[PDB]
Amino acid sequence: AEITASLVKELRERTGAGMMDCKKALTEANGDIELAIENMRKSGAIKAAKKAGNVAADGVIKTKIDGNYGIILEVNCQTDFVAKDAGFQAFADKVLDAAVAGKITDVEVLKAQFEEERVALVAKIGENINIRRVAALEGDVLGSYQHGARIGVLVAAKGADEELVKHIAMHVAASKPEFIKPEDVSAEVVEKEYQVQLDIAMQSGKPKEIAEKMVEGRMKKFTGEVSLTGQPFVMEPSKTVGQLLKEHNAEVTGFIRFEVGEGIEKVETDFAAEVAAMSKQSHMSFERTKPHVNVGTIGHVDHGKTTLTAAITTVLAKTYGGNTSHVEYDTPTRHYAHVDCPGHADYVKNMITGAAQMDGAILVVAATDGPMPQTREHILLGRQVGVPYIIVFLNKCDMVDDEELLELVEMEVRELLSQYDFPGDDTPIVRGSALKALEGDAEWEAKILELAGFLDSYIPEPERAIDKPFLLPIEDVFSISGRGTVVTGRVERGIIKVGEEVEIVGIKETQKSTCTGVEMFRKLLDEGRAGENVGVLLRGIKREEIERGQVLAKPGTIKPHTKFESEVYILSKDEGGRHTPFFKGYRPQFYFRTTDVTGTIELPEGVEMVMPGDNIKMVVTLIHPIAMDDGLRFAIREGGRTVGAGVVAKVLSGASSRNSLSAQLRRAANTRIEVEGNLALSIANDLLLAYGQSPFNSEAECISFSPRFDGTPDDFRINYLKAEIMSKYDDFSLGIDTEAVAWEKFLAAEAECALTNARLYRPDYSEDFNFSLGESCIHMARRKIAKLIGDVPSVEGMLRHCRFSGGATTTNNRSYGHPSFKFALPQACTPRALKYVLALRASTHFDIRISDISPFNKAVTVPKNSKTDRCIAIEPGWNMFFQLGIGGILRDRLRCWGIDLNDQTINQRRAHEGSVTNNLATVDLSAASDSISLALCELLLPPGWFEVLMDLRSPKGRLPDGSVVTYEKISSMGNGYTFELESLIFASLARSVCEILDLDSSEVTVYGDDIILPSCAVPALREVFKYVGFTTNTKKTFSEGPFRESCGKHYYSGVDVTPFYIRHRIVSPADLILVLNNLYRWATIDGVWDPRAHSVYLKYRKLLPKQLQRNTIPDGYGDGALVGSVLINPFAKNRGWIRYVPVITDHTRDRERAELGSYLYDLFSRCLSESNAIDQLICRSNPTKISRSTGKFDIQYIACSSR
RNA sequence: GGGUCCA
RNA sequence: GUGGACCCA
Ligand SMILES: [Ca+2]
Ligand SMILES: [Ca+2]
């Protein structure tokens, strides 16, 4: 100690200056009050001056209204908590009134008039707070809306009332328009932007006034959008602001909007990789049951809470044991996850979103400065969110030469807490240092441990899920013949023993029952423990008195509620939520555990618009009861999509349309478009004409046209469309053609596998002279395969990958194709495969019944081209259960050769690269699946594998033609693994071609028989393929064009030239709407038409029912409606702030489901899943329902979004 | 149930 | 109307 401390808190409470910054300045005035302060005044600017080194990208915005002179101010700081402070408001409420009266529209004027208080402030706070900008709006009737404090707008109108300026101020806050009229545009900005585009599209070789009308149309919609005028009114997006305005009378001279910290770089901040770099700079010189406790550090930005967080880890490592960005560490007794609370809003989001709640906070203030004036906003954050327990660490105590002075800081931080109803008298407060503790100084290393001591004692052990009252969200209800009623779900809390009493509460009059049983797919047990996906048996309750969403809990544990208060976070745009604010009416659906449910909300006191990105307390009244108590998380669901998330805060008490319009559309949908002859052919031909190309003159050409592989990308795109568009059309009369050609083709693939099964058995040329590229490739192939695949199929994979999913089996048919029909009806099963079925049966109590026991499968003919059908095979369904088994273990393995079979997307970018680069080729094989002979599979696969594969295979075929085949091919499509098997066989083969050439095997990528690989291999690969069976289609394999195709995408020199197809005769408005959308998609570039096609589109649009010509949807919403603008759509019944648009569905009649098969299918899936801002967790998978498709259409209303 | 998609 | 992807109702 040096100077008396008692009258230092006097020197301080008069300023707000830091303790030690206030004591060492009283140690140079001899104990002089009014002098010690003056040393500080003229020294506090040496502080605020070394503040330019702190980015100030947070802050607030303000607006004042003097009859009709208005001013908008944006002074920013660098933290959430400061901008919502007591004193920071005071400075900007002040500096906003120096703008009103003394009308200032220069920024430098007040940035100096105040330049004192600004520095006398930061000394008080400690964050770089500069006034950032100001400007005023000169106009007649002007209004100003402010959205919280984050954003403020300024509107100067003319002829509009008290509402009309608020409202168009509210749109401005939402839609941030750069200009006011579609004409307020730098002739240059739109002169460069027209000349930048007028080449772009001329590049592809579009003709002048085509690229021109196209360019122009774009920079029409461009300026339309950025300009207030041509922006859909946000409170009625049917009409623009242009129309909103004029329609009334008025006109706005102009507007202003600032948003806090706009265009402020703000270099990013991590945490884990942040601490690890404070740790490492000094980090050099069984019992899994332990509870998991989340904590968060929350203090002043530079009271070094990043330093205290490091020590907690280097010193808890140096002692005891060993979502995104969150350091964790261990105690002998507990396991801790440590978050940082660097923003108030930001944290609240992560509390609601669920992506990091808190079991105890820890407040980090430095004794050098004591509590910061904004420290109340920290304790406040905790109070609001309700972090139950707050511990305090006093940092940098070494740097204090009087202990009496610490007793004085504690006193402060101890009272501040209790002002916010935190136990501030009995609240643990440690004195220590973080820097020192890193330096290896145990005198201070102890205080870190001490802190850890308090996490282990003060913060209470969070009640293990297992220990709370029983509760299982009902997912689906079955009526099982002689097992009564049964529900399936994941028991979320507690435990249920057989025999116990349960309530089924939720949507109707909370009912009760008693538990008859508990069972999984394998084990049937007598208790369901938390976290387990089970099925619960009930008695004395028909399965029609239970719905999904309902729960099932220990009686009185939980109760059905309708009205509650909450806090929700609304998903921003860039997180795929709304992109349009809502207001008073909002009427979304609330997803609870397992089902949506509708409700109205009521914004709190004084809000009236909400945007994507805002947290918000709101009050929610549901359509009907859900079982709920405080803490229950529920997502906000806007027909299909999640737009918001939110948690129940307090459970309160308990308090458009068009039928003969859907009727009109329904009637039309079911109408039948009708014309003379080949409507499809006609569209194709008029299209060719509209692009300047000789139309087809006979149906014979449509499927016999050869494209030219040169020409600008535009002379080609059409040529290619011309060649491919009609190719797949099943309706061509002109053909001596049949599906007998499909069989003949089938019969050849066999003659093929014949030769190659013999060829591949006889590698004894004569002597040892000559060597075959073929022979060696299968030799290299073999080894790669075996090192990748393994000895033989694990069971770990085998069982976790076997499933039913599909359609027709040998004993089921398309109608009974759904997996639950494979569980209900006994399934055939080849002899060789019987053991696996038994093995399955041997590991489950449920009857696994095998019907027939034959080696036979059914070959059939699905329509395809108009020149050939497709041959397929329907496998014995118990075979197919396991074929999908291994097919999925293969798919999974195949990912280490970087082949990823659920993403033809990677196989189609390389499609496109190879098309500019000309180094990758794309290969096409003809009948692939039909050519993979047994000989080949054996030679390449482990014998281990080649057996399971032999087992699971169907070996003989039975045809429609009554007869029989013994398969030469190891397998054909239809089989549950034939597709990965080709992938594997093909990839391996190709990589071995690569290795033989010093080529990089990384360059082989494969999907089915869509092979991509370095262009120089192709001739080797070709020669290999010829040898081992496969027959390579030169016409469609491209190792040198400007053109490559792969996985449905086609490219010419980087330009997308993928066409569209008219497969069937066009006859429904449904059918035609389709073609018109494929035409639309193929000739639009961001809603802007190529003139030449827009013509042919427009023409044919007229063939549809009037109502249906104007009923339009956005893209990515299917083909139940013409894609166009959904704001022009006159049927777009907006309803509760969310646009519902009607679309044509395929009308279906509901059908009886197989309760047991549906129920096994249910349990077998929960099994399957166990042995194998992001918040989708709150969204399960659907109850099995069945429906026969009828030939009629229906109209379904669905939810859409403006863009 | 719908559409692309490799067979 | 088998088998796979993927967006969609
Ligand atoms: Ca092919
Ligand atoms: Ca291909």
XYZ file of N, CA, C and O in Angstrom, chain A residues 437-489:
212
model
N -0.191 -17.647 -14.021
C -0.499 -19.071 -13.992
C 0.059 -19.815 -15.207
O 0.359 -21.007 -15.135
N 0.188 -19.111 -16.325
C 0.777 -19.694 -17.520
C 2.283 -19.750 -17.370
O 2.925 -20.713 -17.794
N 2.831 -18.697 -16.763
C 4.271 -18.546 -16.536
C 4.872 -19.625 -15.619
O 6.098 -19.698 -15.456
N 4.008 -20.447 -15.018
C 4.440 -21.575 -14.208
C 4.591 -21.232 -12.740
O 5.385 -21.846 -12.032
N 3.808 -20.260 -12.289
C 3.901 -19.714 -10.937
C 2.771 -20.240 -10.042
O 1.681 -19.666 -10.027
N 3.032 -21.314 -9.290
C 1.995 -22.006 -8.495
C 1.306 -21.132 -7.448
O 0.162 -21.388 -7.059
N 2.013 -20.102 -6.994
C 1.451 -19.114 -6.081
C 0.167 -18.552 -6.684
O -0.758 -18.151 -5.967
N 0.122 -18.563 -8.014
C -1.039 -18.137 -8.775
C -1.698 -19.315 -9.480
O -2.872 -19.255 -9.809
N -0.941 -20.384 -9.712
C -1.489 -21.594 -10.323
C -2.523 -22.220 -9.407
O -3.332 -23.037 -9.834
N -2.467 -21.849 -8.135
C -3.382 -22.389 -7.135
C -4.772 -21.771 -7.286
O -5.792 -22.461 -7.193
N -4.799 -20.464 -7.529
C -6.047 -19.737 -7.698
C -6.834 -20.213 -8.929
O -8.061 -20.168 -8.939
N -6.140 -20.680 -9.962
C -6.830 -21.295 -11.088
C -7.513 -22.572 -10.617
O -8.709 -22.755 -10.834
N -6.751 -23.446 -9.962
C -7.293 -24.689 -9.414
C -8.465 -24.390 -8.486
O -9.512 -25.047 -8.548
N -8.270 -23.397 -7.622
C -9.313 -22.914 -6.725
C -10.614 -22.640 -7.489
O -11.691 -23.089 -7.083
N -10.504 -21.915 -8.600
C -11.642 -21.655 -9.474
C -12.295 -22.951 -9.930
O -13.506 -23.126 -9.791
N -11.486 -23.853 -10.479
C -11.958 -25.169 -10.885
C -12.649 -25.843 -9.719
O -13.607 -26.591 -9.902
N -12.142 -25.576 -8.519
C -12.732 -26.097 -7.305
C -14.192 -25.713 -7.193
O -15.029 -26.527 -6.806
N -14.496 -24.471 -7.555
C -15.857 -23.933 -7.467
C -16.814 -24.429 -8.547
O -18.027 -24.454 -8.343
N -16.277 -24.804 -9.699
C -17.098 -25.397 -10.732
C -17.522 -26.770 -10.250
O -18.587 -27.257 -10.608
N -16.689 -27.387 -9.415
C -16.938 -28.752 -8.962
C -17.882 -28.821 -7.779
O -18.296 -29.909 -7.384
N -18.224 -27.667 -7.216
C -19.000 -27.629 -5.978
C -20.231 -26.749 -6.074
O -21.322 -27.154 -5.659
N -20.038 -25.541 -6.609
C -21.074 -24.502 -6.654
C -22.090 -24.721 -7.768
O -23.296 -24.707 -7.524
N -21.600 -24.899 -8.991
C -22.457 -25.291 -10.101
C -22.943 -26.720 -9.866
O -22.136 -27.652 -9.795
N -24.270 -26.899 -9.735
C -24.857 -28.201 -9.365
C -24.856 -29.234 -10.507
O -24.958 -28.854 -11.682
N -24.740 -30.519 -10.161
C -24.745 -31.606 -11.151
C -26.081 -31.686 -11.902
O -27.129 -31.931 -11.285
N -26.045 -31.472 -13.236
C -27.240 -31.465 -14.098
C -27.963 -32.828 -14.180
O -27.392 -33.798 -14.690
N -29.204 -32.879 -13.688
C -29.982 -34.119 -13.570
C -29.916 -34.965 -14.835
O -30.465 -34.590 -15.871
N -29.238 -36.106 -14.742
C -29.091 -37.022 -15.867
C -30.461 -37.343 -16.466
O -31.433 -37.539 -15.735
N -30.543 -37.386 -17.793
C -31.813 -37.635 -18.472
C -32.526 -38.820 -17.847
O -33.736 -38.791 -17.616
N -31.748 -39.858 -17.571
C -32.273 -41.117 -17.069
C -33.084 -40.892 -15.801
O -33.988 -41.667 -15.486
N -32.771 -39.816 -15.085
C -33.299 -39.616 -13.736
C -34.559 -38.743 -13.666
O -35.158 -38.599 -12.602
N -34.957 -38.170 -14.797
C -36.173 -37.361 -14.872
C -37.386 -38.276 -15.096
O -37.211 -39.453 -15.417
N -38.621 -37.754 -14.911
C -39.823 -38.594 -15.093
C -39.984 -39.134 -16.520
O -39.569 -38.476 -17.477
N -40.575 -40.317 -16.658
C -40.694 -40.959 -17.963
C -41.448 -40.113 -18.980
O -42.426 -39.442 -18.639
N -40.993 -40.173 -20.231
C -41.599 -39.422 -21.326
C -41.143 -39.934 -22.694
O -39.954 -39.926 -22.994
N -42.075 -40.377 -23.528
C -41.712 -40.832 -24.864
C -42.616 -40.209 -25.898
O -43.819 -40.430 -25.885
N -42.035 -39.421 -26.806
C -42.778 -38.780 -27.894
C -43.372 -39.813 -28.849
O -42.633 -40.536 -29.524
N -44.691 -39.883 -28.916
C -45.309 -40.813 -29.831
C -44.998 -40.448 -31.268
O -45.269 -39.341 -31.717
N -44.441 -41.413 -31.984
C -44.030 -41.233 -33.366
C -45.009 -41.896 -34.332
O -45.282 -41.365 -35.405
N -45.529 -43.060 -33.949
C -46.511 -43.771 -34.767
C -47.256 -44.864 -33.990
O -46.671 -45.546 -33.144
N -48.542 -45.032 -34.305
C -49.421 -45.948 -33.581
C -49.889 -47.078 -34.484
O -50.346 -46.835 -35.600
N -49.797 -48.310 -33.992
C -50.188 -49.486 -34.770
C -51.250 -50.296 -34.045
O -51.335 -50.258 -32.813
N -52.049 -51.044 -34.804
C -52.913 -52.058 -34.193
C -52.456 -53.470 -34.576
O -52.783 -53.978 -35.655
N -51.690 -54.085 -33.672
C -51.077 -55.383 -33.918
C -52.006 -56.511 -33.493
O -52.454 -56.563 -32.344
N -52.284 -57.410 -34.435
C -53.239 -58.510 -34.246
C -52.875 -59.464 -33.083
O -52.078 -60.400 -33.250
N -53.465 -59.220 -31.911
C -53.187 -60.022 -30.728
C -51.992 -59.553 -29.904
O -51.306 -60.357 -29.261
N -51.740 -58.249 -29.932
C -50.696 -57.618 -29.126
C -51.228 -56.211 -28.811
O -50.494 -55.307 -28.377
N -52.529 -56.048 -29.047
C -53.212 -54.793 -28.813
C -52.635 -53.620 -29.581
O -52.319 -53.706 -30.774
N -52.507 -52.504 -28.883
C -52.010 -51.291 -29.499
C -50.575 -51.055 -29.042
O -50.192 -51.453 -27.938
N -49.780 -50.441 -29.915
C -48.367 -50.206 -29.647
C -47.873 -48.906 -30.293
O -48.205 -48.604 -31.443
N -47.089 -48.135 -29.544
C -46.483 -46.917 -30.068
C -44.971 -47.092 -30.173
O -44.362 -47.809 -29.391
N -44.358 -46.447 -31.151
C -42.907 -46.475 -31.249
C -42.315 -45.073 -31.079
O -42.920 -44.071 -31.467
N -41.140 -45.000 -30.475
C -40.517 -43.718 -30.255
C -39.139 -43.852 -29.666
O -38.607 -44.950 -29.549
